[PDB]
Structure formats: structure tokens, C-alpha cells
Design a protein around this ligand. Structure first.
Ligand SMILES: Cc1cc2nc3c(=O)[nH]c(=O)nc-3n(C[C@H](O)[C@H](O)[C@H](O)COP(=O)(O)OP(=O)(O)OC[C@H]3O[C@@H](n4cnc5c(N)ncnc54)[C@H](O)[C@@H]3O)c2cc1C
Ligand SMILES: Cc1cc2nc3c(=O)[nH]c(=O)nc-3n(C[C@H](O)[C@H](O)[C@H](O)COP(=O)(O)OP(=O)(O)OC[C@H]3O[C@@H](n4cnc5c(N)ncnc54)[C@H](O)[C@@H]3O)c2cc1C
Ligand SMILES: NC(=O)c1ccc[n+]([C@@H]2O[C@H](COP(=O)([O-])OP(=O)(O)OC[C@H]3O[C@@H](n4cnc5c(N)ncnc54)[C@H](O)[C@@H]3O)[C@@H](O)[C@H]2O)c1
Ligand SMILES: NC(=O)c1ccc[n+]([C@@H]2O[C@H](COP(=O)([O-])OP(=O)(O)OC[C@H]3O[C@@H](n4cnc5c(N)ncnc54)[C@H](O)[C@@H]3O)[C@@H](O)[C@H]2O)c1
Lengths: 473, 472
């Protein structure tokens, strides 16, 4: 009853996928989770399902539909009088989606034979896992293998500590019951831009204070430049080189002090979202005699196969090195489970795509132009704008472009970058090609359906070598 | 006077062939006769002027109206009243057409393509007679001719086009008001798309289809779901219903048709005839041109689109194969490259199909029923959008992805989708299939979460019984 082949600590994208895969492989598997959802019961799915990926995308989709009805219907002949959005109802839809999907994970666990434990797991020496239940009582599970998937939480900064319901992190930003009239966001990363977009669409006057001089430095510079222009026009007052140093709450508002190129500045908001990154969670996770070590940044140290310093103990997802993304965590979970089952399964960290769920959506896979320049790789670049896409014109959504980067000597595609409609789907097309070593000409030779947004990738690939049909080369 | 390449027709086949030929350094002419809305010749063929683009424009506008009327409350979005201005909707479509047709002329100018306005006829010895709009003729001496004369709607005596009451797809894209009761003959792609436009805007739509089987070219599982969903959307699709006569009186039309229960009648305010497409060869070939037609009226060509006359090629809807814009354009590229000396080939096995209903329907490769008829043992994996977190956030969970793989080699043989972004997910499958992907190959790749693409990933994993997010 206490013995398992695999004990997983955490039921986020890393842990719950690892648990399902382990069970599919015939391993007697347990998964421990402590997070309490909205109904007062344990809810699986981790950050991503409960306070992350899914909730944010739900509010992004609802808020965009309102925005389009208010600002982009007349051109179609559609007249909608007095369109309004009720924030409590919008948030309630998101909550219902979360409830359904978290229950869905429990259904998958049941179907696959995963044993769930409710409470806090702590790794002791020699792969024993102590579970403190919700009633405070402890039991020890004897594990042949342990998969640590304890995830992350928001970074906290002393200049902007969470305060009442006025200074919030991403979790509180997904729970506003009314549109903040003036909204401040600290951090112009993915989370800050997505959350700022939600509330700007519904009428908030949004300022985003970003300490770095460079916007979206991980994105391709051409993509980031267009993103900054478009998002600023949408009402995200993105201030670069602006570092918050202090805040003061009074009269149900918060005044932020920050330093920019022109010196000390102050700005007052009704709500302030702190979105300055995420940190790995190891709180009470490892006994002093567990043998598992942390790096200087607080991540659990693992090798390229996610194995810790302790045989039979693995760690995956946001608590270890690499991109802090849900699909990265889940793929690591699959790899670890398959390796426990005896398969020499491998993971490719080079083709993990990134998506920013603004509208226009931003997505990419592979290397940026600036990275390849720093590496000394000569490249050919092809782009195609959605302004030249018949499908995008029909959709009344022509902002953005597709960019394909190929090695100048071999024509191998090295990166695909998109800002525009269905960016993530077009990037996935590129990623599939790159898995097979596609050249730019390979993509150019394929039949792409017309009219589709995918044609923009086809034209960009042809443009790499100067023979796109529908733009000057 | 003299050209390396003379192209007859400026549709997706002809205009792309002309651009590519010019890019390859060939002195190229393109002849077109179609008169657009401004009274001048308009390029882009059926697809741009009265086909792909206009239909998708009305599909997108009508869908946005439909969603606002029927699927906003769940988001907390309330309206005091949503209405559609049909003249304004059609005018947006007309403006898109005008911009894109002008865009082709801009591309021709930038690439050095010489345009001729009028009717082109192939004479003997690769001479092309151009009859201008004033009836005057001139002869071009062509080293190579590319025939790209396209297609037009099929006509049937029981439903002849009549004023504005009985129309084909061209007239159906020009209604200035929502018909109260709308009849459609033919439940193919065009009938379903046009029926969808007007049903969304309030028309009571009946689709009369003579065949017993719905969407026979699609995978049967996809077609069954499509029939269910489209019927729920108000397309009263009547299978095994053959129209035999019609009668126009007092701005309405009564249709007579035969179904399993005998002779039936139904009356409509408007009737759309959508009973297929046929190749155009009208006055195209002199009797001694040397180019032959097959029994069905298509120009006879080999797999490189070469006719029975060396240096004369034919592409697009006027030759064999799927009557689709991307098929025509790729044939144009192949022919131009072959004229320039390259042994260019065309892949006829991975041409995708798309039906722009909502939910969208798309597929590439072979259906389950085709593979069973061929005796190929397969494994099938499916994943429903009801289990997609991205689709749930989008409030759009109808449909599924289906992946079919060879049971022995695991090679993916077909990908079929009904649901959001169907065409984009099918293109992902088609790219994989170009590289010979197995189902496990797709399963081992990292798919971004949350995205609609994950449904293809899960379906690929389901082929071999280890999808994560559905029971296996
Ligand atoms: C607003 C926001 C939006 C995001 N949007 C996206 C997106 O769109 N796409 C994307 O790829 N990523 C997105 N992310 C990031 C994504 O959420 C993470 O990368 C992902 O959740 C990490 O998965 P994980 O399993 O490693 O960690 P987590 O999801 O954090 O799961 C860790 C689990 O372990 C539990 N736990 C921790 N310690 C213990 C313990 N001792 N005992 C028992 N249980 C424990 C926790 O309660 C939690 O459930 C977003 C993040 C945020 C904050
Ligand atoms: C309502 C409708 C919707 C459609 N939607 C899609 C879709 O979404 N996706 C898709 O792939 N396909 C779609 N199609 C089909 C698509 O339009 C055709 O497959 C495509 O246009 C064929 O390209 P083509 O160049 O061979 O022929 P065409 O587009 O028909 O062009 C032929 C050109 O040649 C001209 N011509 C003919 N004879 C002569 C002559 N002697 N001299 C000079 N000019 C001549 C014609 O005026 C015409 O412009 C649709 C069709 C219809 C009717
Ligand atoms: O998005 P995500 O939250 O997932 O992570 P992220 O790391 O991608 O974004 C965090 C951003 O917050 C900014 N930041 C940190 N402290 C700041 C401060 N005092 N003032 C202004 N900006 C600050 C950082 O420069 C960073 O660009
Ligand atoms: O392009 P597409 O896909 O729309 O064309 P399509 O050729 O694929 O479909 C045309 C359909 O019209 C139907 N048809 C022809 N005559 C008919 C008649 N009298 N009554 C009812 N249906 C008839 C055919 O059965 C056919 O399924």
C-alpha cells in the first residue's frame, strides 16, 4: 500500500504527465499534490491549469471578442449597439473551464491507475517520500523512483510587495471583479503583456514599466519591434529602461516610483500587477539528508536527462534548468518516465517553441537573427507580411509577418518567427519541418492550401531564396 | 510580337505561371478577358473574383455576426442588439477583391509580364491569336504556350439561371438582402459554404443533394460529424433528393424533387444552383492546333502538364486533378520551371482539401474507407477538441483530429480534421508526410501548450495507444 515504482511530487504539466506516462508503461505510480482549488478540494494541473496558461488564455479570448465587437465590426456591416462585457461573468466562465479541466486530470489518473495523494510531499534520504495529508498526519511512501515536479511561483520584489487587493501578482490579476481604471504592470515580459492586454481591451489605462532597455530580447528583433509598435497602439504604455524602486498605498490606490532616462518618476494606479518573473519552488521539499542539491539560483540540479545527484531521483519542469514552459515540463515528464521504463528516450531542447498570446499572437522556434549573427552564421532571411495574405484580408486581420531564417550555405531552416494570426500554428508547421531537417526550398516545394494563413509561411520560405510569388524579391 | 511564354488566362494557374516564368528570365505574356466590377479587365480568375476570396470574406463576416448573436453571453458579453447590413458586408468583399486583383497587376508590372486584354486562341504551330475587346485580332509567336482557361459552373435544365431568383455561386455572392427562404441544389463544398453564409444571417436554408452519401471524398467519420453539426446550424441538408424541375412566379421559385418518399415540392425566395464545376475550352483551340481534349472536355496532359503538342502546356481547372487553386498555381510553377530547363515535378499525393464552414473541415492523404478498399491495414488515432484546453478557452470545442497510419510501418497516410484551424493542422500533417513522418515521429515532437496543434499531437499518439489526454 506504501510501495510504488514511481512517486511524483506535484501534479502540474510536468508531474501529471509524468505520472500518466509512467502508468501507461506499467509502473505502479503515485502522484502527490497539495494545491487547494476554488471548491476547497485539491485541484490538479499545477500553475498552468489553475492560475496560468488556461485562465490567461480564457480571459484573453473573451476580452479580444469584446474588443473586436466594439472596434472592428463596422467594416463587416455588423452593427452592435451598446456592447458591454460583465467582468464577474467573464471571470466565472474562466473558473468553470478551470474546474472542468482539473476534474479531467483526475479522470485521466483514474483511467490510467495513478494513485493520488492529497498533501505535501517531502523527499527523505533513499527515495522515501513523506506525505503530510490535509489533516496534518504523515505517512511515508517507499519509492523505487521519485520524480520531483514542484514547479514555480511568482518572483517577489521589496519595492512592490503584495498588498491587500491593490498590489497583486499574476494570480490576483486573473481574479479582478471589475476593470481597473488605471492599471500598472511591472515587467514587460510574456505575463505582463498578456495580463495588460486583457484589461486594456476592457478599458483600463495600462502602463507597463520594464527595467531593460530592450523589448522581448529573446524574440527576433524584427518581430519584437513590430510587437512594441502594435501593442503600444493598443494602449499598452510600455516604458522601457524604467526600474521601479518604491511604492506607496493610500486611498485605495498605489503610487509607484521609478527611474528612467529622465530621472525619478511617479505614477499612480488603482491596481498594480507584479510580473517580474518566476522562481523555482523547493519550500520544505527536500529533507536535509535527501542528497538532492540546488544551484545558486535555487533550481534543482539535474543532467541532460533530468536526473538529480541521487540515483533514482529525477526533477522536471519549472524547478530545473531550461525554458519555464508547460510543454517543456510535460516533455521532460515523458522522457523521465520512459527512461525509468528502460527506454533510451531523448529530448530535443532546440525545437521548443515559444508563444505570446497577445493579439496579434507572437510565436517562434529556433534561433533569432541576432543570435545567429553573434554566432557568426551567415544566413538568408525571407519574410512575408499578412497584409499580402488573401486569407488574412478576408479575416480583417492583416497585422504582422512571417520570418524564415536559413543557413546561407546549406539552406537549412534555423528559425521561424511569426507575429500575426495563428502564429503558434504556423510556427508548429516550421518546427515539424525543422525536426526533419527541412531546408527553405523544401518548404517552398510543398503544396499549401489556398486561401490559408499557412501560405504566409510558404511565401516566406520561398522569399529566403528570392522567388516568392506574391511579393517583390 | 515574339514571346518565350504566352499564358492564356490569369487565374491562380495562369498568373502564377506568368510570374514564375518572368522570374526565370523568360519574356512572358499573359492574356485575360474577364471584365471586373470597374468595367476593365480584372486578373485573378475565378478564385479571386467570384470564388475563393469572395466566399471566405462573406464566411468570415457572417461567422462574426453569428458568434455575436449566439455565442457571446457565455463570455459575459452583452449587446442591446446585433444586426447585419448586407450591402455593407458585400461592399467589404468587393473592396477586398478590387485590392487583390489590382495587386496581381502590380506583381505583373514588377516582374515584367506583358498583359494582353482579350480572348486567346491557340492556333497551329504555337501561334496564339488574341481577339481584343474591340474585336480586332493580333497573332503572338510563342516558343511555349501555357493554357490556363479554368472552369465555370455546371448548369442543369431543371434549374436554369433566371433573373436574380435562380443564381449560381456568382450571384449568391451578390445578394443585397438576406433571402427569407433559400434553396441550394448540391451539398458539395460550394453549396455548403454559400448555404452557411446566408443561414447565419437569418435565411431558412434547404440543401437538396441527389446522392445518398454526404461528402463522399472526406473521411466517413469526419463527414458524419460534419452532417450532424451543419444540420444543427440550420442547413437542412436533404440527401437522396434530386431536383427535377423548377417554376418561377411572383418573385418566388417552386422546386420539384424526388426523395425516398416520392415526389416533393418546396418553395423559396431564392435558389442557388451549386451542382459542380466544368472546364472551359470555349473557342480556345483551333481545329488544327494539335492539342487534344479527353472525353470529359479537359485538355489531355501528362504528369508534367504537357499537351500532345511540344511546347504547349495546360494547367489548373482545365486539366485533370483536384479543381483547387493551390493545385493550379503549383502546376503553373512546375511548367514555368520546366520551360527554363529544370526537371520540375509535381506531388499530386499531398494536395489538401479545405471546406471553409465553421467548424472548418480539411484533410490530406487517404481516408479510412479508401485504405480499406485498397486492403491496407491501418491504425487510427483521434482526439476531440472537447478535450483541448485551448479550444475550451476559445469556446469552440466541436470536432476532432484523425490520424491514419500504416499498421506495419507506422507511416502517416492521412490526416483529417473538423474543428478550429482545421486547415492549419492539416498543413502540419502534410509537412510531416512530405518528410515521410510516422505517427510516433509526430508524437515525439514538442507541441506548444496551449495550442490547437496539440490535438494533432494527441491524435498521433493515439494511433499507437498512448495519447496522454484521452483514455486509450
Ligand atoms: C499567468 C501565467 C501564464 C502562463 N501561460 C503559459 C502558456 O500559455 N504556455 C506555457 O507553456 N507556459 C505558461 N506559463 C508557465 C507554466 O505555467 C509553467 O511553465 C508550468 O506550469 C510549469 O509546469 P510544472 O509542472 O513544472 O510546475 P507547476 O505548474 O507550477 O506545478 C507544480 C505543482 O507542484 C505542487 N507542489 C509543489 N510542491 C509540492 C509539494 N512539496 N508537495 C505536493 N505538491 C507540491 C504545486 O501545488 C503545483 O501544483 C504561465 C505561467 C503564468 C504564471
Ligand atoms: C464559390 C467558389 C468558391 C471557391 N473556393 C475555393 C477555395 O476556397 N480554395 C481553392 O483552392 N479553390 C476554390 N474554388 C475553386 C477555384 O476557384 C479554382 O480551382 C481556381 O480558380 C482554378 O484556377 P485556374 O487558374 O485553373 O482557373 P480560373 O480561376 O477559372 O481562371 C481562368 C482564367 O482564364 C480566363 N479565360 C478563360 N478562357 C480564356 C481565353 N480564351 N482567353 C483569355 N482568358 C481566358 C478566365 O476569364 C479566367 O480568368 C472555388 C470556386 C468557386 C466557384
Ligand atoms: O513574464 P514573466 O513574468 O513569466 O517573466 P520575465 O522574466 O520574462 O519578465 C520579467 C521582466 O520584469 C522586469 N523587472 C524585474 N524587476 C523590475 C523592476 N523593478 N522594474 C521594472 N521591471 C522589472 C525584468 O526586466 C523582466 O524583463
Ligand atoms: O464545387 P462542389 O463541391 O460544390 O461541387 P460537387 O460536384 O462536388 O457537388 C455537386 C453536387 O450537386 C448534386 N447535384 C447535381 N444535380 C443535382 C440535382 N438535380 N439535384 C440535387 N443535387 C444535384 C450532385 O450530387 C453533387 O453532389
Amino acid at each position: 500500500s506504501q510501495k510504488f515504482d514511481v512517486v511524483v511530487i506535484g501534479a502540474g504539466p510536468g508531474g501529471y504527465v509524468a505520472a500518466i506516462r509512467a502508468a501507461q508503461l506499467g509502473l505502479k505510480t503515485a502522484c502527490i499534490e497539495k494545491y487547494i482549488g476554488k471548491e476547497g478540494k485539491v485541484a490538479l494541473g499545477g500553475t498552468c491549469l489553475n492560475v496560468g496558461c488556461i485562465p490567461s488564455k480564457a480571459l484573453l479570448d473573451s476580452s479580444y471578442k469584446y474588443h473586436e465587437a466594439k472596434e472592428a465590426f463596422k467594416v463587416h456591416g455588423i452593427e452592435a449597439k451598446g456592447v458591454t462585457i460583465d467582468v464577474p461573468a467573464m471571470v466565472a466562465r474562466k473558473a468553470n473551464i478551470v474546474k472542468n479541466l482539473t476534474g479531467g486530470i483526475a479522470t485521466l489518473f483514474k483511467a490510467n491507475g495513478v494513485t493520488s495523494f492529497e498533501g505535501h510531499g517531502k523527499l527523505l534520504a533513499n527515495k522515501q517520500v513523506e506525505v503530510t495529508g490535509l489533516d496534518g498526519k504523515t505517512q511515508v511512501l517507499e519509492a523505487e523512483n521519485v520524480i520531483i515536479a514542484s514547479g514555480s511561483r511568482p518572483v517577489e520584489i521589496p519595492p512592490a510587495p503584495l498588498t491587500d487587493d491593490i498590489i497583486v501578482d499574476s494570480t490576483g490579476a486573473l481574479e479582478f471583479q471589475a476593470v481597473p481604471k488605471k492599471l500598472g504592470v511591472i515587467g514587460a515580459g510574456v505575463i505582463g503583456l498578456e495580463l495588460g492586454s486583457v484589461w486594456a481591451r476592457l478599458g483600463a489605462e495600462v502602463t507597463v514599466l520594464e527595467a531593460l532597455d530592450k523589448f522581448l530580447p529573446a524574440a527576433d528583433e524584427q518581430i519584437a519591434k513590430e510587437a512594441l509598435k502594435v501593442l503600444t497602439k493598443q494602449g499598452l504604455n510600455i516604458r522601457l529602461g524604467a526600474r521601479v524602486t518604491a511604492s506607496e498605498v493610500k486611498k485605495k490606490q498605489v503610487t509607484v516610483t521609478f527611474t528612467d532616462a529622465n530621472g525619478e518618476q511617479k505614477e499612480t494606479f488603482d491596481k498594480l500587477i507584479v510580473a517580474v518573473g518566476r522562481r523555482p519552488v523547493t519550500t520544505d521539499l527536500l529533507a536535509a539528508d535527501s542528497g538532492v542539491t540546488l544551484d545558486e539560483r535555487g533550481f534543482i540540479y539535474v543532467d541532460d536527462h533530468c536526473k538529480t545527484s541521487v540515483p533514482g531521483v529525477f526533477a522536471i519542469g519549472d524547478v530545473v534548468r531550461g525554458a519555464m514552459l508547460a510543454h517543456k515540463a510535460s516533455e521532460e515528464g515523458v522522457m523521465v518516465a520512459e527512461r525509468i521504463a528502460g527506454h533510451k528516450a531523448q529530448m530535443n531542447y532546440d525545437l521548443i517553441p515559444s508563444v505570446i498570446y497577445t493579439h496579434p499572437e507572437i510565436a517562434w522556434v529556433g534561433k533569432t537573427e541576432q543570435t545567429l549573427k553573434a554566432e557568426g552564421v551567415e544566413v538568408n532571411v525571407g519574410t512575408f507580411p499578412f497584409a499580402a495574405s488573401g486569407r488574412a484580408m478576408a479575416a480583417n486581420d492583416t497585422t504582422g509577418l512571417v520570418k524564415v531564417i536559413a543557413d546561407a550555405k546549406t539552406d537549412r531552416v534555423l528559425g521561424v518567427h511569426v507575429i500575426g494570426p495563428s502564429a503558434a500554428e504556423l510556427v508548429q508547421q516550421g518546427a515539424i519541418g525543422m525536426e526533419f531537417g527541412t531546408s527553405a526550398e523544401d518548404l517552398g516545394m510543398m503544396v499549401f492550401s489556398h486561401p490559408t494563413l499557412s501560405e504566409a509561411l510558404h511565401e516566406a520560405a520561398l522569399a529566403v531564396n528570392g522567388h516568392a510569388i506574391h511579393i517583390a524579391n
